[PDB]
Ligand SMILES: Nc1ncnc2c1ncn2[C@@H]1O[C@H](COP(=O)(O)OP(=O)(O)O)[C@@H](O)[C@H]1O
């Protein structure tokens with residue numbers, strides 16, 4: 008099932024491109040020319056179908072063509088339709104005959120949908136569209152991810168013989184990391200449940216596999232054991248995806264030229280703070296909460312006083328169970344993973360003691376009372392008093408100091424300090440903001456504990472980046488959480504479109520190769536209505552928060568008048584005062600602007616921060632490590648949204664400096680079913696990942712864009728006599744390398760500062776390089792061992808006089824007996 | 825499964841690679857007695 | 870006196886006097902003489918490697934007439950590589966050394982050839 012607004016977007020994106028030539032030279036129809044069409048009752052009666060394969064009847068009509076439905080089978084009734092709804096179709100072409108989408112004769116919307124339809128359903132999810140690679144979510148393991156396949160792509164010589172896969176990319180990324188000595192980055196793109204998190208793991212498992220077994224896997228151990236903990240703590244069950252990433256994951260890894268991760272740095276950002284406190288129906292909280300209140304041992308069930316999964320206010324009691332998920336078995340694996348992260352049993356117990364404390368504090372009921380003089384002044388319940396006292400001793404904090412910052416209103420003006428009392432709703436917020444900060448700082452403390460052991464001393468030089476973000480997510484009700492997620496996705500896209508198209512277009516032109524233009528759709532307008540400083544949905548939110556007399560309703564109005572033009576901002580038809588729509592790359596998304604200012608502000612007070620910093624427990628102190636204790640009005644750098652965008656901004660430039668690689672994950676259906684094709688949902692994703700737009704890049708011809716220097720480092724072994732040749736110039740060096748290896752004048756091209764080469768002759772040079780690489784892989788390894796040999800020999804030679812005393816005293820002992 | 829769709833690469837022994845269903849992408853050689861002519865341009869519908 | 874008495878000496882070093890050497894250290898040991906097997910031959914090797922098997926493998930696979938044949942590449946043999954550019958190939962490819970790299974060049978001595986390196990390594994062994 009797919010929603011009408013999804014259908015709305017899916018319908019609009021289709022467009023007639025290339026004219027149909029289903030007519031013979033004389034003036035009659037061919038022997039049944041087949042064409043795709045959007046007109047047929049099967050398309051009307053079913054959402055999943057947008058186009059049917061119809062064959063033109065042997066009759067006539069050149070002006071208003073006659074057709075019969077063939078795929079799927081129809082009534083066999085000959086119906087007439089307009090040629091504007093006729094798209095050219097390839098019939099002789101086999102979908103499993105080739106990997107690159109750009110190899111089709113007709114590359115129109117339905118022709119690409121079908122080429123991907125027959126690949127997915129025959130269980131070949133990976134399809135290239137160079138530089139891009141399309142991975143459709145199969146929803147079932149095909150075994151193509153196992154160690155056997157890793158080893159194949161790893162030890163296989165010719166890249167040409169190998170079929171499209173996440174490993175094809177993982178190897179070509181690592182082929183440049185060591186080939187030219189440039190930092191590379193892998194980017195998993197796609198909507199909520201497309202397969203980003205899973206694909207990251209596969210490419211991580213690829214780098215984990217080493218050719219030669221002589222490596223220190225102690226660092227590589229914590230790196231891999233972190234992921235099932237990061238999914239327990241950071242991932243939660245949603246209606247869109249049951250393992251939905253509520254945090255953004257970014258890695259930096261130093262991998263060996265044979266394989267295996269030497270060092271790493273997992274840097275996680277923006278954790279869905281609201282998911283801890285409140286969860287929607289059929290939607291579940293972070294896996295670790297349910298894992299710990301199911302799989303905990305009898306000792307932790309009495310020491311912490313653990314209750315059932317339903318008994319907690321911070322946990323949805325009806326959504327408690329997930330299909331195909333055994334939170335007990337996952338917990339077993341989580342505990343061992345914590346051990347592998349060099350955490351002691353004492354360090355692990357405290358991690359769960361804080362989690363037990365968070366859960367317990369949530370259950371405590373704050374009620375109204377006739378105190379302070381202004382009434383409604385909150386009070387901790389008499390029966391829930393012992394519940395609160397146990398929770399504060401579970402999180403290792405002073406139970407009277409935490410009670411004071413939540414119940415007593417501490418406000419300091421100028422010099423004179425003023426004492427009061429917080430109201431019922433206000434104290435519930437202080438209780439909630441405390442649980443939110445304890446969980447987020449703990450989750451990030453595990454990241455810090457990991458990075459403490461896995462990080463390289465003296466940073467990274469030539470590392471491998473990997474970016475697992477939260478994909479586009481649309482629900483019935485979308486809020487600030489959903490706003491920040493969809494912003495991330497649009498940001499990743501802006502930088503994608505720039506690198507892949509805008510930069511490449513300028514590169515070929517500046518080098519003096521192709522003056523031709525690249526046609527593509529950018530989010531330039533929609534990214535600015537959200538991220539352009541001064542004039543954007545994010546900047547107007549910050550202005551409303553920093554302003555004292557600013558409301559949630561005043562914010563919508565602030566956007567509606569300023570961001571009126573450019574279309575990308577459209578205020579809601581229903582309750583415009585509290586709702587607004589954004590024209591995303593996935594279509595229109597409506598956000599209920601309720602609590603937008605409150606959510607953006609939610610970051611724990613300096614008053615409670617001091618209590619957690621003064622803790623008698625070391626782990627509890629280390630949570631708020633070097634944290635600015637702030638009192639009064641919230642600063643622009645303390646505001647969640649402002650703190651989010653600046654973190655995102657910095658991360659993008661870090662990625663722009665490297666050589667990115669794109670993985671475009673497609674979610675075929677919402678029903679979460681294998682071998683189920685839904686043309687609307689897929690088409691939107693074919694646009695939103697710019698798969699159809701990536702076809703224009705065929706025009707370039709050349710599949711190698713590197714400077715004379717970059718060519719001379721990766722390739723010089725072909726003939727080191729003309730490569731090291733100091734007299735001849737570098738422009739003349741590169742061309743002579745191709746002369747010895749032998750090339751036709753069509754494969755290579757001069758270039759101003761760059762060296763342009765078509766993929767056609769690329770592998771021909773790479774294999775000629777490998778023929779001189781292997782004879783030098785062993786030549787290096789023989790001399791390298793012949794010295795390694797004499798290192799032990801010379802070290803032994805100095806110990807010979809000391810051994811001559813052991814033996815002389817042994818001979819002495821043999822004389823006595 | 826009794827039969828797989830394969831493809832001759834570059835003879836008394838064929839350099840075939842499994843295409844339907846997708847395989848390891850390994851080019852293996854087999855006897856022509858186990859090679860049956862296949863229609864490719866032909867649509868089943 | 871001959872290779873037979875020198876092979877045994879080399880095992881007790883790479884094994885660190887162990888009876889059963891680890892597969893990875895056995896490859897260091899063979900290479901230290903001028904022995905490199907094909908992808909197939911390197912799979913034909915036993916699970917647990919011992920002194921008795923090592924010495925049989927030594928006789929069969931070691932080059933005697935020209936101890937280091939594998940160093941010779943005649944396009945790479947006659948050619949002269951600068952000390953700095955040579956270390957460039959070494960530092961990127963390296964699977965062993967750390968600072969013993971400076972000591973290899975001392976075993977040879979600005980522009981060096983592979984026939985010079987092999988000749989000096991024949992006197993090293
Ligand atoms: N390569 C794959 N093979 C099989 N199933 C997959 C694959 N990738 C993803 N899935 C399925 O998709 C679900 C969600 O995947 P995930 O990567 O966590 O998505 P997201 O990008 O939303 O975090 C998994 O639970 C699994 O069933």
Ligand code: VO4
Pocket residue numbers: 197198199200201203204247248250251252253476477478479480
């Ligand atoms: O479900 V997601 O991990 O794509 O947010």
Ligand SMILES: [Mg+2]
Pocket residue numbers: 195200201202203204252475476477478
């Ligand atoms: Mg993802």
